Design a binder for this molecule. Structure first.
Ligand SMILES: Nc1ncnc2c1ncn2[C@@H]1O[C@H](COP(=O)(O)OP(=O)(O)O)[C@@H](O)[C@H]1O
Ligand SMILES: Nc1ncnc2c1ncn2[C@@H]1O[C@H](COP(=O)(O)OP(=O)(O)O)[C@@H](O)[C@H]1O
Ligand SMILES: Nc1ncnc2c1ncn2[C@@H]1O[C@H](COP(=O)(O)OP(=O)(O)O)[C@@H](O)[C@H]1O
Ligand SMILES: Nc1ncnc2c1ncn2[C@@H]1O[C@H](COP(=O)(O)OP(=O)(O)O)[C@@H](O)[C@H]1O
Ligand SMILES: Nc1ncnc2c1ncn2[C@@H]1O[C@H](COP(=O)(O)OP(=O)(O)O)[C@@H](O)[C@H]1O
Ligand SMILES: Nc1ncnc2c1ncn2[C@@H]1O[C@H](COP(=O)(O)OP(=O)(O)O)[C@@H](O)[C@H]1O
Ligand SMILES: Nc1ncnc2c1ncn2[C@@H]1O[C@H](COP(=O)(O)OP(=O)(O)O)[C@@H](O)[C@H]1O
Ligand SMILES: Nc1ncnc2c1ncn2[C@@H]1O[C@H](COP(=O)(O)OP(=O)(O)O)[C@@H](O)[C@H]1O
Ligand SMILES: Nc1ncnc2c1ncn2[C@@H]1O[C@H](COP(=O)(O)OP(=O)(O)O)[C@@H](O)[C@H]1O
Ligand SMILES: Nc1ncnc2c1ncn2[C@@H]1O[C@H](COP(=O)(O)OP(=O)(O)O)[C@@H](O)[C@H]1O
Ligand SMILES: Nc1ncnc2c1ncn2[C@@H]1O[C@H](COP(=O)(O)OP(=O)(O)O)[C@@H](O)[C@H]1O
Ligand SMILES: Nc1ncnc2c1ncn2[C@@H]1O[C@H](COP(=O)(O)OP(=O)(O)O)[C@@H](O)[C@H]1O
Lengths: 173, 73, 173, 73, 173, 73, 173, 73, 173, 73, 173, 73, 173, 73
């Protein structure tokens, strides 16, 4: 059988997804919990040119704020007591495919920045030093909070907003 | 504060993307051009860059008017 | 001689214990203080397949909330001023046997989570880093408070409830 | 909101466990099937998974009805 | 010359002291201010087997409630801004001898507990960590308040009562 | 609620201590045994443990009756 | 020219001052406002052996009750948000000389105590910790209220009374 | 309640201080000794300690009587 | 054109203002509502040496009695929940110029004092701590109530009266 | 209660200020000196300090009499 | 069909409403209970330029006098035991539209003032602190009592009267 | 007490508002000017400010007389 | 076409730039964000004698305070784990040309000093050791904060102020 | 505290720079010389060194007065 989309506003949103097909600009999805955000990311990617490519979805809340900037990107050896190898990255694992960051508002100012730098340059370095890796990952942010607000609270970098705010989809409860 | 820039810039962009995503989009309609000039553009040049890449992709025919734009602006 | 069970509701509860015998799903016991909760855990385990195996009962109230997440699981060296060796665990001591957590409601949100993760995965890590130990311990929670309530108070993780709520026994005063 | 799922799922589960704990339990009775459909299932699929592992263990004969279920649901 | 005991009830209490001689179970003394409590402790100890051993009397009121749990027992280095050495203890100074805690009711719930643990185990640790010292001190509590009452007020641990309530002497005004 | 325990327990204790403090105390008298059974024993087994270590020390002869006990119970 | 004393009771009080000369025991001066208390302190000290030594007079009312126990004695660093250096003391400034505490009744129970301790031991510590300073200051209390009364009101420590009540001068209106 | 102590103690003190402040004070007169015994001494030993350091300093001759004492007691 | 003064008593008061010119001692103006008090302050200052300097007039009634001692002077950070910066002051804004406190009687005893201290010393501190600012402000108090009276009511500090009562002008209805 | 102070003090002050505000004021007249001595001076030395700074400023010629003073005292 | 206006005095009042159309100055409506006041407000607003904009009518009597100054404006967090978020406002909800305060006389002196301040400045702060919000709301007061009277009773601020008394409509019974 | 102000002020106001609400109102008629001068103006300048914003809005032609004013004053 | 300067104060500032032409003394530019500071630096340099020479503008905020003293100047090999070659410098890259340090206040005390040393001597060493390089770079500092203030806060070296304060331009918002 | 230095020093500097930047600047005018002497010179000799290199460059004619200086001092 199939999936489920039939209400006007969604009859719509599906198409918006379909059009966005041939694209790679990041996408910002927003709706209350349960509305289908992460279901749209997944669909956007099933529809993007890189459907067959991996889907690296990671809940930004499912990781202590102090280790996100260690697992998203990666880690350069001996910089934090105990390192079995410079740590790879979800960015690197998502290289060539999609990287669905769920619950964006929960990004530390430090990573909010560090992401921005990788959304524009596409290059990143694991900790102190310089970039030595090439990643081609389409950003897909989804959050249930109101981004704009957070911007006047200073909890959310504005320039990072507009950067992910290329394509913006809003799922109605 | 450069409404004399919105329509030219926008037109720049609409060209970039129309060519970037191989879309038969030639340009904005009057009705649309108005809107673009009224929007406050907080993001300024940046926001317009996005608003239009987005409008180029969402585009269905050869032109863009209140239709796709209102979706955003 | 013997032990004591003769009232209908208990004439019952004993059997429920007997049936549960061949199982390992966690069990949630609840009754006012003194009703026999910890007496049932002990009996459940005397009856489980692992009776001969250890019984690691630990009162969650008999340890300052800040050191529970250091003794239940274990501790990775030099993470807290002074560490004679990465600290073992009641989980590790209870490996292969039962782990009767008394007075569950008294679990910090941080450990309530950390337990859940070990009830599903069965793997755990001592502090920051990753899991490197294998523990097979049957969870047996007993509390005298009303769990559900605590869930609307936000003091008790719901998903951790249903996870321990596989088998639920309620001892009447 | 998928009462058309409760009875099939439940039946899935009753199978899993009946095989997991080597119990000669074949399935639910009408009387039981009703209850399962009326329960609100706040936990949803999860809660039903538990409610039935539990009912499979508590099971005495070949079937399950109001008996074991009411104990919970 | 001598000391003073001649009234029946005291003609008595002296003997009770004399009998208790060969013992070490804690003792709970109670009487209005001035009745001779601290005079009895002192006599109990002059009579115990450890008379020649030290007498570490300490008024529980003569120390701010927040520093009692730092001086009775002891203190493990760097746990409170400024520590010249892990702090010894009146318990340790009273090791081998008597420890007359005057005005018991004035014990914080935290220490009331911490004492209990040392009345049973006899081992204690200075702050967070574990016991590494051996103390043999006979507890001698004296208070002018009515313990029992305090128990229904929750200001006084019951189990700590019965523990010190091994031998109980009551000095009549 | 185990008056059938007081007299045996008590007797346990009286033995422990009589041996612990080298006291020629053999046991309780009837008069005493009664009291011990009537006391409510809020502390229960614990309180009796103390009440008797205390009574063993206070003991003067070979037995214990209303005498030493009343001092407490 | 000179100063003014000619009435019998004062013709007297002057002498009492003169005799007290060779002393250092604290002195308690009491009379209605304006009677000449602070004029006597000053004279007592002009006559004591330490006349050439400093005179540290401080109105106990001229300082908010919450900062007296911070300026009389002194202050150990970082114990109250913002400390440029452990604070010296009027006690330390008055070391070797007189310390005329005016309007004693206005002493907080906490300092009334803290003073007593320094009238007997002569050693003091700035906040929590221990004494590390040596002060030789002659106490000179003057108050216009009736001390005794205050003692039955519990607003004034009795033992601190008798301690300052070594030498007591009463100026008649 | 130890009037048998006032006169000996007092005499202790009068000695301490007479030596502490180099005062040729030998002791109290009858008239004085009486007073000291009648005073209630709320402060007790302490108050007498003070009352006499004070009386030793106030002392003019070799003895102390109603004179200096009344000033206080 | 000009302003308005022609009645004898005012033909006068103008001059008194003119003479006072070369001065800086505070001035106390008193008259019924509307009589021209605040018109005289303004004129006194137009005539003082510091006419070109600012005029910081502030109605003492136009601010809740609990926030006057926070805005007149200033405020030292984190002393009251929420502080964006240690608060400046009308005293500091009036530094170098005039500070016309209207309706003086409406000063809390706490500030009545705090002002006095700044009328004599000229130095002030924002909350607890010490003075770290230099203000040269000429005080100009105006009130419509009868000061003296208020002094027997205890609602108005006397010494603060005489301090502002250097130059006193009374505007007749 | 020191009328022997008013005229000397006053004269002190009149000097301070006469020099502080560069006023050619030499001193008080008899008529004035009287008043100053009769005033009760509740403020005492303080009030006189003010009364005269004020009188020095209000001063027009070389002297001060009932004139400026009455304004206050 | 339509609404109802046909008597001369009302045939009138309708027009007055119509003229007032192009305005925003507050309006003061007064008539006995039931006369149609709240029907006129509603009509004034249906006719003002902001008809399509919201109509925030709130009975000043339908809220305990102690919580009006908490709901009209808004509330700054933790200032009153229990605050889930700094409270929004009917002023804020009425921003851009009309705010019909019914039964004005029932305004506490404290709010009567607080309103005035917002009728002139248009800025307001939720409790202690400062304004941080921008509200454009047209005031529409209606009361059945005689305002003027209340002014001589001191129950109603006069300056607040004239401020709302820009346009005044009186509905005859 | 400044009747010489009412007519000028009023005229100020009538100008402000006539321009604020785009009303072709030039000024007051004699009949009107009289009234304005007789009214007691308790509110004073303030009340006149309102009375006229109100009269400017209520205005129908180019002038204002007893008509609109009486409505208030 | 051209650039934009037409207001008096700027009609001015342009000239000041023009005059400064034939110079090399550092220049201190200050104005609120966006005022045109970095636009003036750029113009100063387009006008200096070294216009054709490079322009090395570097935001002092666009680099973690711990790596600025590693990239501005340069780095001597093996002094920090991992060094591919002794690191060159923006100073060295700016040799012969301008070095526009934006947001000066954001300079660590350590570099504030290290810059001073290079503004006077013109010689610098990469880490520990001695100078072995010759750099001729004209300093151009621009900050939006008030330097002077920072000097009383101790966050900004004074002598470094006057050194850059040779020529000072202030852009009005 | 060496106002006798400001004018000589300044004059030193004005010479250094006038020669360093090839500017036909001979010296300060009275009006200017005054200012230089009144300025507090917190930086002292250093600040004057800068203030004048700066004034030499800003210089337009042969002299310097309130003009260029006020820009700074
Ligand atoms: N439009 C839809 N059609 C069918 N199923 C949906 C739809 N939207 C959501 N779901 C279902 O609801 C669940 C919630 O999904 P999800 O989108 O991940 O939540 P959230 O929007 O908070 O990220 C999913 O498991 C999915 O199967
Ligand atoms: N059903 C029972 N039969 C015999 N003894 C029991 C029974 N229930 C409880 N007890 C006794 O009561 C005591 C209280 O036991 P426990 O179950 O541990 O308390 P709680 O239920 O609060 O954990 C035990 O020491 C045990 O011997
Ligand atoms: N549609 C389903 N059919 C059969 N079993 C299911 C179904 N959905 C969930 N389950 C079972 O119920 C449990 C709930 O799983 P999960 O997918 O994690 O729920 P959630 O929607 O909260 O992510 C699982 O362990 C799984 O085995
Ligand atoms: N039975 C007694 N015989 C002789 N002196 C006693 C007796 N009881 C108390 N005292 C005296 O009374 C004083 C009060 O003593 P203390 O027992 O310490 O008070 P409290 O009972 O409140 O602790 C002691 O200094 C002691 O010398
Ligand atoms: N049934 C018993 N028979 C003999 N002694 C006992 C018995 N129960 C308890 N005791 C004694 O009484 C004390 C009470 O012990 P405990 O078991 O800790 O009580 P609780 O029920 O509160 O846990 C113990 O020190 C023990 O020596
Ligand atoms: N006996 C005296 N002889 C001369 N002057 C005195 C005498 N007593 C008080 N004074 C004067 O009276 C004033 C009040 O002094 P003071 O003793 O300080 O007040 P108080 O007794 O309330 O502390 C002093 O300034 C002092 O000069
Ligand atoms: N019995 C005594 N004989 C001689 N001097 C005494 C005696 N008792 C007390 N003193 C003196 O009186 C003072 C009172 O001392 P203290 O023992 O502390 O009293 P308290 O009973 O309140 O503890 C002491 O400083 C001491 O020198
Ligand atoms: N002497 C005067 N000449 C001209 N106008 C005056 C005079 N006195 C008062 N006014 C006017 O009267 C008003 C009331 O002024 P104000 O002095 O501020 O009141 P108050 O005396 O209560 O402070 C002012 O607006 C002012 O223009
Ligand atoms: N005896 C005096 N001779 C000259 N000036 C005095 C005299 N007494 C006080 N003054 C002046 O009067 C003011 C009153 O000062 P102060 O000593 O503080 O009074 P008080 O007695 O209330 O402490 C002082 O500023 C001082 O300059
Ligand atoms: N002029 C009118 N024409 C038609 N209905 C009216 C008119 N005036 C009042 N009403 C009706 O009378 C009721 C009373 O309305 P309301 O104006 O709100 O009372 P009040 O004047 O006391 O605020 C309303 O429900 C409304 O429908
Ligand atoms: N003299 C005037 N000329 C023109 N307009 C005035 C005049 N006085 C007051 N107004 C107007 O009347 C209103 C009354 O203002 P305000 O000065 O605040 O009165 P008040 O005397 O009560 O302080 C102001 O909003 C102002 O625009
Ligand atoms: N005077 C000006 N004329 C023309 N454009 C200007 C002028 N000032 C600033 N700008 C423009 O404004 C922007 C802000 O520039 P910038 O000077 O770098 O900011 P800031 O002063 O904070 O460093 C630049 O992109 C520039 O094109």
């Amino acid at each position: 059988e199939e999936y489920v989309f039939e209400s006007p506003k969604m009859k719509e949103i599906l198409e918006k997804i379909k059009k966005i097909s041939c694209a790679e600009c990041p996408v910002l999805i927003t709706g209350e919990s349960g509305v289908g955000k992460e279901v749209v990311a997944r669909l956007i990617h099933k529809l993007s040119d890189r459907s067959k490519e991996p889907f690296v979805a990671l809940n930004v809340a499912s990781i202590p704020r102090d280790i996100f900037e260690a697992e998203l990107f990666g880690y350069e050896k001996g910089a934090f007591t105990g390192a079995v190898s410079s740590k790879e990255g979800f960015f690197e694992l998502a290289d060539g495919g999609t990287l669905f960051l769920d619950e964006i508002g929960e990004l530390s100012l430090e990573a909010q920045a560090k992401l921005l730098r990788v959304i524009e340059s596409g290059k990143f370095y694991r900790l102190g030093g310089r970039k030595e890796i090439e990643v081609n990952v389409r950003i897909l942010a989804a959050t249930n909070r109101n981004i704009k607000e957070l911007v006047k609270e200073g909890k959310f970098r504005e320039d990072l907003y507009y950067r992910l705010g290329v394509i913006e989809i809003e799922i109605p409860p | 504060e450069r409404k004399e820039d919105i329509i030219p810039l926008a037109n720049h962009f609409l060209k970039k993307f129309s060519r970037k995503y191989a879309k038969e989009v030639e340009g904005f309609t009057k009705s649309a051009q108005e809107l673009l000039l009224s929007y406050p553009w907080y993001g300024n040049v940046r926001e317009l860059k996005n608003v239009i890449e987005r409008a180029v992709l969402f585009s269905e025919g050869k032109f863009i008017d209140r239709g796709e734009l209102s979706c955003l602006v």
